[PDB]
Amino acid sequence: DSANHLPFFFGNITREEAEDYLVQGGMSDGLYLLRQSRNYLGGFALSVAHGRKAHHYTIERELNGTYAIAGGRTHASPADLCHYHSQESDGLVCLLKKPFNRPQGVQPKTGPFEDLKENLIREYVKQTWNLQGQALEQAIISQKPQLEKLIATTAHEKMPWFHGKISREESEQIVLIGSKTNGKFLIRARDNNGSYALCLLHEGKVLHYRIDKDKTGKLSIPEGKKFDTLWQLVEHYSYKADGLLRVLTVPCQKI
Amino acid sequence: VYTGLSTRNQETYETLK
């Protein structure tokens, strides 16, 4: 995607990391960077310094493939949105004055999903199309953009922490095998209805947090941050407890 | 028994509304 070519795109960094970068850059009015949304699929976040405070905007990908902040006009790309807001404030806290660029040789951050994504597309096309050699390579190239959203919404099935439809009791048994590492975790399906449980090891005891799909199709622990995908939810709670008794550490391997 | 979050999500995003 074209936002990797932007010098001020930091990839999958957290809000806190974005704020750390803005302070490193002087926290000057209209200093800004771009990052990948950690809870909106296909989305970005704009992080802007003004009045020595950080202001964070989600840039959502619309159904039609344009990009908009809530209450804003649509743009062809995050780059076009940033260029636009360098000319007109149009409800933003201030004008975008100066990009904060990644220091040279520092790459955009990728999560586990981002690192696996090409292999998941390849495996899916091999399995559905049953092609080999150049014919397989062409089918991959042709279908990649059509398949991105399908692979993003089903990629959790192929991730080491996802154990599918197992009981509460089975999930306790699997987590309590081996080293009782704090933060050891898995996710299980409850309903095959968009209902799941996060099973987390805390001081030798297995805690169960419910995950539900709301009417928008967003996943959350009740009163928690909302995500489009389970892999987003795991990446989030692997960085910060954010209301869990502790941060997620080692995935419980399937047995 | 399900455990609940020890805090509601409290970070705001700004909008252009």
UniProtKB/Swiss-Prot annotation, chain A:
Localization terms from the record: Cell membrane; Cytoplasm, Cytosol
Interdomain A: where is this region? 101-160
Tissue-specificity statement: Widely expressed in hematopoietic cells (at protein level). Expressed in neutrophils (at protein level). Within the B-cell compartment, expressed from pro- and pre-B cells to plasma cells.
Q: Which domain of life is it from?
A: Eukaryota
- Residues annotated as carrying Phosphothreonine in the record are 249
Q: Which residues form the SH2 domain?
A: 8-100, 161-252
Kindly list the positions at which Phosphotyrosine occurs in this protein: 21, 40, 124
Q: How is it modified after translation?
A: Ubiquitinated by CBLB after BCR activation; which promotes proteasomal degradation.
Residues with PTM Phosphoserine: 37, 195
> How is the subunit organization of this protein annotated in UniProt?
Interacts with LYN; phosphorylates SYK. Interacts with RHOH (phosphorylated); regulates mast cells activation. Interacts with NFAM1 (phosphorylated); probably involved in BCR signaling. Interacts with VAV1 (via SH2 domain); phosphorylates VAV1 upon BCR activation. Interacts with GAB2 (phosphorylated); probably involved in IgE Fc receptor signaling. Interacts (via its SH2 domains) with CD79A (via its phosphorylated ITAM domain); the interaction stimulates SYK autophosphorylation and activation. Interacts with FCRL3. (Microbial infection) Interacts with Epstein-Barr virus LMP2A.
Entry note about domains = The SH2 domains mediate the interaction of SYK with the phosphorylated ITAM domains of transmembrane proteins. Some proteins like CLEC1B have a partial ITAM domain (also called hemITAM) containing a single YxxL motif. The interaction with SYK requires CLEC1B homodimerization.
Question: What is the associated disease?
Answer: Immunodeficiency 82 with systemic inflammation: An autosomal dominant immunologic disorder with onset in early childhood. It is characterized by recurrent infections with various organisms, and multi-organ inflammation that manifests as colitis, hepatitis, arthritis and dermatitis. Patients have a propensity for the development of lymphoma, usually in adulthood. Disease severity is variable.
Functional summary from the UniProt entry: Non-receptor tyrosine kinase which mediates signal transduction downstream of a variety of transmembrane receptors including classical immunoreceptors like the B-cell receptor (BCR). Regulates several biological processes including innate and adaptive immunity, cell adhesion, osteoclast maturation, platelet activation and vascular development. Assembles into signaling complexes with activated receptors at the plasma membrane via interaction between its SH2 domains and the receptor tyrosine-phosphorylated ITAM domains.
Task: State the family named in the UniProt similarity comment for this chain.
Answer: Belongs to the protein kinase superfamily. Tyr protein kinase family. SYK/ZAP-70 subfamily.
What is the protein name given in its UniProt record?
Tyrosine-protein kinase SYK
User: What is the originating organism of this protein?
Assistant: Homo sapiens
From Swiss-Prot, chain B:
The PTM Phosphotyrosine maps to 2, 13
Q: Which residues carry this modification: Phosphothreonine?
A: 15
List modified residues, type Phosphoserine.
6
Q: Where in or outside the cell?
A: Cell membrane
- Summarize the protein's role: Adapter protein containing an immunoreceptor tyrosine-based activation motif (ITAM) that transduces activation signals from various immunoreceptors. As a component of the high-affinity immunoglobulin E (IgE) receptor, mediates allergic inflammatory signaling in mast cells. As a constitutive component of interleukin-3 receptor complex, selectively mediates interleukin 4/IL4 production by basophils, priming T-cells toward effector T-helper 2 subset. Associates with pattern recognition receptors CLEC4D and CLEC4E to form a functional signaling complex in myeloid cells.
Per UniProt, subunit arrangement is: IgE Fc receptor is a tetramer of an alpha chain, a beta chain, and two disulfide-linked gamma chains. Associates with FCGR1A; forms a functional signaling complex. The signaling subunit of immunoglobulin gamma (IgG) Fc receptor complex. As a homodimer or a heterodimer of CD247 and FCER1G, associates with the ligand binding subunit FCGR3A to form a functional receptor complex. Associated with CLEC6A. Interacts with CLEC4E. Interacts (via ITAM domain) with SYK (via SH2 domains); activates SYK, enabling integrin-mediated activation of neutrophils and macrophages.
- Which family, according to the similarity comment? Belongs to the CD3Z/FCER1G family.
From the Swiss-Prot or TrEMBL record, give the protein name.
High affinity immunoglobulin epsilon receptor subunit gamma
Q: Supply the source organism for this entry.
A: Homo sapiens (Human)
- Record lineage: Eukaryota, Metazoa, Chordata, Craniata, Vertebrata
State the encoding gene: FCER1G
Note the residue range shown relative to the complete protein. Answer: 64 to 80 of 86
